[PDB]
Write a protein that binds this ligand. Sequence first.
Ligand SMILES: Nc1nc2c(ncn2[C@@H]2O[C@H](COP(=O)(O)OP(=O)(O)O)[C@@H](O)[C@H]2O)c(=O)[nH]1
Lengths: 420, 69
Amino acid sequence: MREIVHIQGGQCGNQIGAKFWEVISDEHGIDPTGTYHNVYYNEATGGRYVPRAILMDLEPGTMDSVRAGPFGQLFRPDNFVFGQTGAGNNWAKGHYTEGAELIDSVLDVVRKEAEGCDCLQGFQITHSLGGGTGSGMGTLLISKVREEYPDRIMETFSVVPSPKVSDTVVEPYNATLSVHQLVENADECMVIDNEALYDICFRTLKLTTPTYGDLNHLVSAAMSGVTCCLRFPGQLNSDLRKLAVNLIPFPRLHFFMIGFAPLTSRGSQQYRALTVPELTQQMFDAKNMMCAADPRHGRYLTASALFRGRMSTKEVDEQMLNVQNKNSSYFVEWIPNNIKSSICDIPPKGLKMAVTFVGNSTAIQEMFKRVAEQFTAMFRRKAFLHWYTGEGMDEMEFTEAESNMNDLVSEYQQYQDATA
Amino acid sequence: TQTLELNRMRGMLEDDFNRKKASIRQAVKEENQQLDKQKRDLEKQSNNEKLNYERTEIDMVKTRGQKRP
Ligand SMILES: Nc1nc2c(ncn2[C@@H]2O[C@H](COP(=O)(O)OP(=O)(O)O)[C@@H](O)[C@H]2O)c(=O)[nH]1
């Protein structure tokens, strides 16, 4: 009955997964032992609950990571598959030689869990696109599972590489090789990049020392709010498929943007009473999204907004109408009423209102444009190319991947410029 | 007068027959209401008993530390 498996991958994917599971346990009132105080969790002996997630990585460090953090005992060792080497920023080490001998086993633990459900609404993945482990393994796994269950949808909660504040020197190769395959067998590539997360956590909460825990917690909140309207009843209910239908007009313009609301700090908290138009103004601000792409620099093909709490639906729909009608330039003409709404009935822990905004918008082709820029700048010199040539990989796959990337960005551009 | 004495006979007999049948139907409804409590309570008992037994099993399993000779 509309269940969801939660596959992870790579160190960042594993961190985000642990954070998401503890946040969901907080919302659903579970404690770090798995006792109350079917869509996500599974029942187990003694009234215990275990998350329906699998955890894969080539290095065993993340094992001790997810064991060390709170709510680490919710999981089950049958879903702790782990290699030994660790890709170490070698995408091929996660897709052809080393990752393969793991993914096979992972398939089992997927089908050891998929058939456990009865009406599987679809999967969801949490990983990075720069790290060899996450990117490569998750890409091969997407391939396998989309070959297996083509009927269900496969969300990919991916964190694209930090465009300007790079932490590794091999980001472009892995990002391009991953996107080339993700654009085919995925349905929801909601991109996140740490540039936007630091921007938000600095200039919207005045925080002191933002560690990765806080970014993971923020992405966790957004992840939850995305499907909470299905987890709970509502005056106007949605799901993981209504979103897909109302968000993509063509089989490959499915790359989204994510936004959360509300977010303020203590000083700004004591003011600014909570009311739906204020939430709208905070949600449609440019810098208030998880993507380092000023959305004004593009148009919104379409955008859905899921509210959580008790409100007045007329106010919701009228705010949506006003905001799509006043700023008609930034929205696209050849499609009408291009905004979408939904409303749940249970907000988060002690938050009388909550907004989660997901937008398919052609303002995000710039991210791929600049990543491909870095790629082509690093490729015409064959720099750091032996590390990949050594693994049976050739040089044709790279130019094919870059040409597919450029075909995708050309699709975005071409069917942005169109009219009626 | 005779035909009225007889029509009242028919009327009383029928308005007694119908009330009797309705009483039978209400008694059957009560019997089903009663039967429902059995499946309302046996399942509760079995649920609590499974809880107790499986909790005791979890305890007995977890109660395996180390020996250290
Ligand atoms: N929000 C967040 N981003 C991370 C985290 N860890 C790494 N990133 C970024 O993701 C990239 C590294 O990916 P990583 O998972 O370490 O490599 P992998 O082990 O091969 O999957 C780098 O761009 C990191 O900056 C994390 O824990 N939280």
